[PDB]
Design an enzyme around this catalytic site. Structure first.
Site, short mmCIF file in Angstrom:
data_model
loop_
_atom_site.label_atom_id
_atom_site.label_comp_id
_atom_site.label_asym_id
_atom_site.label_seq_id
_atom_site.Cartn_x
_atom_site.Cartn_y
_atom_site.Cartn_z
N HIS A 71 41.14 22.77 52.68
CA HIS A 71 40.15 22.40 51.76
C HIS A 71 39.93 20.91 52.16
CE1 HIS A 71 38.90 23.25 47.15
NE2 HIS A 71 38.00 22.30 48.04
N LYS A 94 40.08 29.01 49.16
CA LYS A 94 41.00 27.89 49.69
C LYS A 94 42.04 27.29 49.23
CE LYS A 94 36.30 25.51 49.77
NZ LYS A 94 35.80 26.22 48.02
N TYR A 139 39.67 24.83 42.20
CA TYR A 139 38.61 25.52 40.84
C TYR A 139 39.35 26.26 39.63
CZ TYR A 139 35.86 24.40 45.38
OH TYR A 139 34.99 24.19 46.26
N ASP A 164 31.83 31.62 46.79
CA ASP A 164 32.91 30.37 47.17
C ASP A 164 33.68 30.42 46.03
OD1 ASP A 164 33.30 28.17 49.33
OD2 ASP A 164 33.60 26.79 47.99
N1 LIG Z 1 34.85 22.34 50.25
C1 LIG Z 1 34.81 21.42 49.54
O1 LIG Z 1 35.64 19.92 49.00
C2 LIG Z 1 33.96 21.10 48.53
C3 LIG Z 1 33.25 20.27 47.09
C4 LIG Z 1 32.01 19.99 46.46
C5 LIG Z 1 31.29 21.49 45.94
N2 LIG Z 1 32.01 22.46 46.67
C6 LIG Z 1 31.00 23.95 46.68
O2 LIG Z 1 29.84 24.27 46.96
C7 LIG Z 1 29.60 24.74 45.71
C8 LIG Z 1 27.71 23.57 45.28
O3 LIG Z 1 28.66 22.78 45.65
P1 LIG Z 1 28.42 21.47 44.28
O4 LIG Z 1 29.18 21.89 43.63
O5 LIG Z 1 28.64 19.91 44.54
O6 LIG Z 1 26.73 21.98 43.41
P2 LIG Z 1 25.05 22.49 44.06
O7 LIG Z 1 24.70 23.31 44.54
O8 LIG Z 1 24.37 20.87 45.07
O9 LIG Z 1 24.28 22.28 42.73
C9 LIG Z 1 24.38 20.58 42.21
C10 LIG Z 1 23.39 21.56 40.28
O10 LIG Z 1 22.92 21.88 41.31
C11 LIG Z 1 22.32 22.61 39.41
N3 LIG Z 1 21.01 23.51 40.43
C12 LIG Z 1 21.39 24.71 40.66
N4 LIG Z 1 20.49 25.47 40.89
C13 LIG Z 1 19.27 24.63 41.11
C14 LIG Z 1 17.53 24.87 41.01
N5 LIG Z 1 17.24 26.05 41.54
N6 LIG Z 1 17.22 23.74 40.15
C15 LIG Z 1 17.73 22.79 39.56
N7 LIG Z 1 18.69 22.51 39.58
C16 LIG Z 1 19.92 23.56 39.91
C17 LIG Z 1 22.73 23.08 39.31
O11 LIG Z 1 23.05 23.15 37.87
P3 LIG Z 1 22.92 24.68 36.88
O12 LIG Z 1 24.62 24.63 37.27
O13 LIG Z 1 22.63 23.74 35.25
O14 LIG Z 1 22.31 25.49 37.04
C18 LIG Z 1 24.47 22.23 39.93
O15 LIG Z 1 25.08 22.20 39.18
C19 LIG Z 1 30.76 24.08 44.20
O16 LIG Z 1 30.52 24.90 43.59
C20 LIG Z 1 31.97 24.05 45.61
O17 LIG Z 1 31.91 26.02 45.20
C21 LIG Z 1 32.87 22.46 47.88
#
Ligand SMILES: NC(=O)c1ccc[n+]([C@@H]2O[C@H](COP(=O)([O-])OP(=O)(O)OC[C@H]3O[C@@H](n4cnc5c(N)ncnc54)[C@H](OP(=O)(O)O)[C@@H]3O)[C@@H](O)[C@H]2O)c1
Ligand SMILES: NC(=O)c1ccc[n+]([C@@H]2O[C@H](COP(=O)([O-])OP(=O)(O)OC[C@H]3O[C@@H](n4cnc5c(N)ncnc54)[C@H](OP(=O)(O)O)[C@@H]3O)[C@@H](O)[C@H]2O)c1
Ligand SMILES: CCCCCCCCOC(=O)c1cc(O)c(O)c(O)c1
Lengths: 315, 315
Positions: B112, B79, B50, B45
């Site tokens: 997006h 997106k 980004y 994704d």
């Molecule tokens: N459509 C949109 O508007 C939108 C908005 C937000 C996000 N997104 C997409 O969704 C993705 C994921 O969402 P998000 O970036 O908000 O983060 P997330 O998937 O909620 O993860 C949050 C944090 O969790 C940590 N993490 C991951 N695996 C873990 C584990 N096994 N144990 C403990 N901690 C862990 C990561 O830190 P570390 O990197 O240090 O592991 C990360 O920064 C984004 O990268 C993006 O692709 C899209």
């Protein structure tokens, strides 16, 4: 342990009270705020009125700089003093507070009191010396200026203090209201528990924040010395024994369990570190009803002086 | 483990989240995307927002070139950013993405956000005062232009992100609709599980794709730092202990078992490889009800400026 505010921000439910009378050297505020942060306090309550924003801010900045906390871990409150209610004075008063504390934003800015006071600069050298001059401001326009401060990113959240129900409704019913006050910071303790005002605040999603939760500093300048001493109450003492805590801790816990966010001022290292123990125990429902019974409608803030102000919250 | 989309294409149910804040050197996204693919992630994704499409694309090409995967085994999402909603900007924005990634097609192109922004070359166009400049576009016309991108073979599937039910119906009810959105990528986790939106999406054969499934990156710019930390939830932790997994794994598994496709960002080799273990265990129905009970209607992402956008999806 934080509560969700009605603007989506989060406020720690235990706050450190920073006011001390003008006899206390301001260096003490610096020392005790560092101690509070070291003990675990994260919510810190100050105001332009207190003449301590520099010392309080330097404490905060010091603990941020040395890596004990990040700025984001600290929830800092200031307050708009009553001589700055006129809408064009609001943002500069916030800016002045921010410069004193050397912060980029306050986590919370409150209207300190609905009792507006004459702004600005007299013009004669002495005529008005000592007098207390009231002013009349539509507090809705004060509130709009507050809303603009939040939109400018200068205050994360905005609220009020010492408002009564009528004064709250006036803001809530304002045409074109953008942001509800997140809170109303008022005197609140087992001798004046504010249950009715609390019910009202809860119904509108406004958090009640309790000051003089430990029964006030009993400052000679106001407080009647014959008023009962809250922490000597026999019910508070018996609960303290039952729980192996202290009467202060009982009184603080009481507020937390009724959904109230509670402040506690101490300039004593050991009492500061005691007060953070509030999260270690819980009162029963029966304990809570017993403390509810102590209400005696006792205001340690003997505002008597201001009783003829049109916005006096107890008229 | 894929789900059949409403256009006949297949989307893997676990996706790799590639966004990292700008303090992270841009080279990392190349490294971590390769690590994600090596670990077993097939769905990836990204977005124009980004600023990593070149690096993410290089990772994908590398693993195709070396034979670890075929292009047809990878599901790549990009997106359309909110400054490119105007129908004539949609195809060139997609083409610009494809040229950056050095890919010929995306597996999925999303709108997006429904919150249109002034067209131009800034991502966050701001006026004289520092305030973000909104635009008004009929998103049905944006959607038609997306339909044309799919007909041109530039995107295998098309969908949306951050749409609410009303915004979805508007597309579904469009006259002469050719393609339903295959998905709606929205904030979704045990504190904001979106069950009502999910029921709706399922009734229309639209897959809900969860972002911030692990409780977001808690970026200061958009998330309150005193909001509760999702992976510290005591119910998530006790389920992790019961299953001998981790709280992240519990939160990811939850989503999979309610029919939600789930994203997980990690830039850490060991957490990336942990996250693929989601397919090794299953939560009981009771476990699922317990996680359902955590819902507190908490969207981590907040913005005062965007809250006032007519198309703000949480108003
Ligand atoms: N459509 C949109 O508007 C939108 C908005 C937000 C996000 N997104 C997409 O969704 C993705 C994921 O969402 P998000 O970036 O908000 O983060 P997330 O998937 O909620 O993860 C949050 C944090 O969790 C940590 N993490 C991951 N695996 C873990 C584990 N096994 N144990 C403990 N901690 C862990 C990561 O830190 P570390 O990197 O240090 O592991 C990360 O920064 C984004 O990268 C993006 O692709 C899209
Ligand atoms: N919005 C308003 O108009 C308003 C009005 C009043 C107060 N406030 C705010 O609320 C704060 C607290 O209210 P307050 O100043 O009246 O005081 P308070 O919190 O009721 O405390 C009163 C006294 O209790 C003592 N104390 C603290 N911890 C104790 C413990 N664990 N055991 C026994 N005694 C203890 C302190 O003495 P030591 O210092 O000796 O420990 C303190 O002077 C203020 O500092 C200010 O931030 C706001
Ligand atoms: C003759 C009138 C005196 C005016 C000056 C006010 C009288 C009481 O001052 C305080 O000690 C005080 C302390 C706080 O913590 C407050 O926020 C607050 O609102 C007041």
């Amino acid at each position: 342990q934080c509560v969700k505010l009605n603007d989506g921000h989060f406020m720690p439910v235990l706050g450190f009270g920073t006011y001390a009378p003008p006899e206390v050297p301001r260096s003490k505020a610096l020392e005790v705020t560092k101690l509070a942060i070291e003990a675990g306090f994260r919510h810190i309550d100050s105001a332009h009125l207190y003449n301590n924003e520099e010392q309080v801010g330097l404490a905060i900045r010091s603990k941020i700089a040395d890596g004990s906390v990040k700025r984001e871990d600290i929830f800092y409150t200031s307050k708009l003093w009553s001589t700055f209610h006129r809408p064009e004075l609001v943002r500069p008063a916030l800016e002045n507070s921010l410069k004193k504390a050397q912060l980029d934003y306050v986590d919370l800015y409150l209207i300190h009191s609905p009792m507006s006071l004459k702004p600005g600069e007299e013009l004669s050298p002495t005529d008005e010396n000592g007098k207390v001059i009231f002013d009349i401001v539509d507090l809705c326009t004060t509130w709009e200026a507050m809303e603009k401060c939040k939109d400018a990113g200068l205050a994360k959240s905005i609220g009020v203090s010492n408002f009564n129900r009528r004064q709250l409704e006036m803001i809530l019913n304002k045409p074109g209201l953008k942001y509800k006050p997140v809170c109303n910071q008022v005197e609140c303790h087992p001798y004046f528990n504010r249950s009715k005002l609390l019910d009202f605040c809860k119904s509108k999603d406004i958090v009640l924040v309790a000051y003089s939760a430990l029964g006030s500093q009993r400052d000679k300048r106001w407080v009647d010395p014959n008023s009962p001493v809250l922490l000597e109450d026999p019910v508070l003492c018996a609960l303290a024994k039952k729980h192996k805590r202290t009467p202060a801790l009982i009184a603080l816990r009481y507020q937390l369990q009724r959904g109230v966010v509670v402040l506690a001022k101490s300039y004593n290292e050991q009492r500061i570190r005691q007060n953070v123990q509030v999260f270690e125990f819980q009162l029963t429902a029966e304990d809570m009803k017993a403390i509810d019974g102590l209400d005696r409608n006792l205001h340690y803030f003997n505002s008597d002086s201001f009783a003829s102000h049109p916005n006096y919250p107890y008229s």
